[PDB]
From Swiss-Prot:
Anything else known: Present with 6730 molecules/cell in log phase SD medium.
Originating species: Saccharomyces cerevisiae (strain ATCC 204508 / S288c) (Baker's yeast)
Protein name: Cytochrome c peroxidase, mitochondrial
E.C. no: 1.11.1.5
List of residues binding heme b: H174
Amino acid sequence: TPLVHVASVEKGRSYEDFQKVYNAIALKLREDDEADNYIGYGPVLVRLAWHTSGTWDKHDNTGGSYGGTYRFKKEFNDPSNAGLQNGFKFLEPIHKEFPWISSGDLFSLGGVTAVQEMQGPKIPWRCGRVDTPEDTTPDNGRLPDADKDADYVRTFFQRLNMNDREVVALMGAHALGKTHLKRSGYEGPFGAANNVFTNEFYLNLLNEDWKLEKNDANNEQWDSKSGYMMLPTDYSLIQDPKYLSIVKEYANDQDRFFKDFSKAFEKLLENGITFPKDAPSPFIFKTLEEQGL
Ligand code: HEM
Ligand SMILES: O=C1O[C@H]([C@@H](O)CO)C(O)=C1O
């Protein structure tokens, strides 16, 4: 039997405590509005949560969000994580304000807060991740390659126990922010609204005119007449006929896309964690806007 990670709620903490940590991330998001040319820290926090979760292997329960291992040099220096140090740095003063929260809880809560605060769906979220030692840090190379096709994508995500719908849903996070040539070898915004969470990823894939080109690091990307880009793995969602059908469904139903993404994103952030029968129910946090804050 693989490793077992039992959710253990930070001693004495309840929903109100975590709503505070959320509110502090949310306030700071509002505050550092100007970053990445007025994109903000929203997207990088969404990406930080996915990457700290996306090391999971279903086969042996190694990696995943539970251990908060990104805080160790091997994981924070992962070439795939280039840039994410900004997300870490952003969450640093949050963690000094709320030092009782585990690292895994913080990184994953950062992703939740970012989505909700960019007008994304509500993402139920559970506390109880527990910091694990350095020797538990997963090796580099577990996050995906961008220069690949649909067959790669489908296989890759099987290791995260994600099916076709879950893959297409999670990839709509590429409505957010942009690629940076210095970080990934790709350059450009994915779409128009860079820090507002919509189903624009699917609509753009279908409606724009894309042209495959070599960028300034000699990597291939799909470039639109409108000035957007897609990764080869992004564009594969319309080259594969099963993916294409789901792309069309999300392009044509914002509510279903929100619903599906919420489920898949909670699932991604919870993979590898055992929650006790007596654990609290997932928390649905209020936005600042819903609190009047
Ligand atoms: C086939 C799978 C995926 C590949 C190959 C991939 C690859 C990439 C690359 C190369 C970048 C640009 C990094 C940079 O230069 O700043 C990027 C950005 C981003 N990714 Fe993905 N990604 C994948 C799936 C996902 C998923 C599942 C999520 C979250 C649910 C996600 C969220 C993001 C976000 C928010 C950004 C923009 C961050 C920013 O603006 O700094 N990606 N992705
Ligand atoms: O959301 C984002 O945050 C980082 C930026 O803040 C780094 O300074 C980034 O790349 C985004 O698009």
